[PDB]
Design a protein around this ligand. Structure first.
Ligand SMILES: CC(=O)N[C@H]1[C@H](O[C@H]2C[C@@H](C(=O)NCCS(=O)(=O)O)N[C@@H]2CO)O[C@H](CO)[C@@H](OS(=O)(=O)O)[C@@H]1O
Length: 613
């Protein structure tokens, strides 16, 4: 039959359970009946029996919200001292530090002392504040004299590293002998420029070295030049460990490398000769490439660890660095040929270097129909389907992502097709991606809002493929996207920029919260794109970077250049987020250019070289 579960649901929310108890007998078959049961139990959880709660965890353990019930119930079980039942259901995988701390309590009061100390210490050595349950644990741990000054000092270091200075200071006022360098550590953490006064930070002991090390690492981000200078002093004056020294060299090296200062190269080379730090090894190479030092670059690309050497990046850059070093050599044509078959950015570059067509190769995976039925008939799916038909977007979305948490590779692809068939593009894109079936370009690069984008792109004369690329990279066709810093929508617009974009020329924006309309999003995004497209002479490489990082940042990254190749520039973008963002948009625009039958190379003729000269 047809069921109105809203009445039962309405009652339970802030109230009674009579309509649920009354109607429930009718809704055995209904998919969302377990949500009512969940709330009904949850309200009276304190007085519920173990047998009932345990029964509920068996019969509806698949529910997305089940972890919250386990947290609420285990609080009580531990509060009651029912530890036998606690440990039967305690799960580290839930990632509740309150439970982990309660589990530590159990270990200490039940003979597992070694494991209680390991648990306590692991939860202690953490630069943020922990739940009040942990104060209880840390109390017991301290009570057995395990909270040594070293371990409070070590957490102090982490808290200052985390910029949580209230915590850090509270820990500093708990140091019996080291209270002076604790206060000093928080001072330096707040302003590491104070290390200019070498006289004041010259007390040759381990703690002073700990603070100067923290300071040099922090100072490296803002004034690497000053830090490099002070390292030379402080390494004589203070008893730095070798591991402490490489961590300083890392941050100074990386910070100088990102400013294209060649003084990083002797430092990086001295302190990581083994190439043990990927990020240092990559930026050493990136830096050589920026300086036109093709010989050293190539040499370095031949020494890489196996996990860097496997990537399409350093395969491309081994070939290209050799081709720049020895232009008349043919060894690169082979290297590019291995790589030009891949469908990624560097694979497109390789093909572009040979002047051969790209390999897109849309080959939708063929699914076992039995697997398609198993996923379709799973209760988590039925529930997600129902929430969709009802119009509850977040609930349908949550059920989808929770089910995907433990599906195998076949089951994830099966899931992804079903979502695609319902014109629900983002969860299809998401599910197929975590299956790692990359070759279904129909699912991964859908034509959502094609009528809009094609027209908008003609307005503010742009390539249809490039607008499609930007959106797909920015949201993956989820209008509901809110960023970790507040950029929202199909074209992840900065709320502070969105207003300014609406004010600058602009047409009516009707609030930040009500920006979610795709059609609101699209013509604004086209306008902003054209603005930056214009700002950088129609260069999509630069313009794409400006979109995600700001034109002022891109200008700083173009500073003092002269005939810089496009591929080197992209590679030598300081920000990881933005390097990938550009490489994605450029690749996605190749793929959309195909699917829109308006072929688009990886870069246009006029994008290949640029400078601020
Ligand atoms: C459309 C637009 O104007 N974009 C603006 C961009 O906004 C980004 C941020 C990212 C984002 O939110 N990232 C989150 C990362 S995380 O921390 O959550 O993981 N998503 C947006 C586009 O990609 O921020 C810049 C910072 O000044 C602006 O430069 S400016 O010169 O105008 O100021 C750009 O103008």
């Amino acid at each position: 039959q047809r069921r109105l579960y809203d009445q039962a649901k309405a009652a339970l929310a802030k109230g009674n359970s009579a309509p649920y108890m009354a109607s429930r007998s009718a809704l055995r078959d209904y998919p969302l009946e377990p949500y009512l049961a969940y709330d009904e139990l949850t309200h009276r959880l304190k007085s519920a029996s173990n047998e009932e709660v345990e029964r509920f965890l068996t019969e509806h353990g698949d529910l997305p919200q089940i972890g919250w019930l386990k947290l609420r119930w285990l609080r009580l079980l531990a509060d009651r001292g029912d530890w036998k039942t606690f440990v039967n259901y305690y799960d580290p995988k839930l990632n509740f530090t309150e439970l982990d701390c309660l589990y530590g309590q159990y270990q200490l009061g039940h003979g597992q002392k070694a494991e209680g100390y390991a648990t306590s210490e692991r939860l202690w050595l953490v630069g943020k504040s922990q739940p009040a349950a942990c104060d209880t644990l840390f109390g017991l741990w301290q009570g057995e004299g395990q909270l040594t000054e070293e371990k409070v000092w070590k957490r102090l270091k982490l808290a200052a590293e985390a910029r949580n200075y209230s915590l850090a200071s509270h820990l500093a006022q708990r140091l019996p002998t080291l209270g002076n360098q604790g206060a000093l550590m928080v001072s330096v953490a707040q302003n590491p420029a104070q290390l200019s006064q070498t006289g004041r930070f010259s007390q040759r002991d381990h703690a002073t070295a700990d603070v100067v090390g923290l300071g040099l690492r922090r100072l490296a981000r803002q004034d690497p030049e000053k830090a490099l200078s002070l390292l030379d002093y402080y390494s004589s004056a203070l008893p730095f460990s070798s591991d402490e020294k490489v961590a300083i060299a890392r941050e100074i090296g990386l910070s100088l490398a990102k400013r294209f200062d060649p003084r990083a190269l002797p430092l990086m080379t001295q302190y990581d000769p083994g190439l043990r730090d990927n990020t240092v090894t990559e930026w050493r190479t990136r830096l050589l490439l920026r300086l036109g030092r093709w010989d050293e670059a190539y040499a370095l690309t031949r020494k890489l660890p196996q996990d860097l050497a496997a990537t399409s990046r350093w395969r491309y850059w081994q070939a290209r660095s050799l081709q720049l070093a020895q232009p008349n050599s043919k060894e690169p044509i082979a290297l590019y040929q291995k790589l030009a078959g891949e469908r990624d950015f560097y694979g497109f570059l390789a093909a572009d270097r040979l002047s051969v067509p790209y390999k897109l190769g849309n080959r939708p995976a063929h699914i076992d129909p039995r697997v398609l039925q198993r996923v379709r008939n799973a209760a988590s799916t039925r529930r997600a389907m129902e929430f969709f038909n009802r119009g509850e977007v977040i609930n349908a979305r949550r059920e989808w992502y929770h089910a995907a948490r433990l599906f195998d590779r076949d089951e994830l692809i099966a899931q992804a097709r079903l979502a695609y068939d319902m014109q629900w593009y983002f969860p299809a894109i998401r599910s197929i991606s975590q299956a790692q079936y990359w070759d279904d370009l129909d699912i991964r690069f859908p034509m959502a809002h094609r009528a809009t984008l094609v027209r908008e792109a003609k307005n503010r004369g742009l390539h249809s493929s490039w607008i499609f690329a930007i959106t797909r990279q920015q949201s993956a066709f989820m209008s509901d996207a809110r960023s970790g810093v507040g950029a929202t929508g199909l074209m992840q617009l900065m709320p502070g920029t969105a207003k300014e974009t609406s004010r600058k020329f602009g047409i009516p924006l009707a609030s930040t919260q009500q920006l979610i309309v795709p059609d609101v999003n699209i013509r604004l995004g086209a306008a902003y794109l054209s603005q930056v497209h214009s700002q950088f002479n129609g260069n999509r490489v630069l313009a794409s970077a400006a979109y995600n990082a700001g034109p002022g940042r891109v200008r700083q990254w173009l500073k003092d250049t002269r005939h810089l190749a496009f591929d080197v520039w992209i590679e030598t973008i300081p920000f990881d987020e933005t390097r990938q963002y550009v490489q994605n948009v450029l690749s996605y625009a190749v793929i959309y250019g195909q699917k829109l039958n308006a072929p688009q190379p990886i870069v246009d003729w006029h994008e290949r070289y640029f400078d601020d000269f």
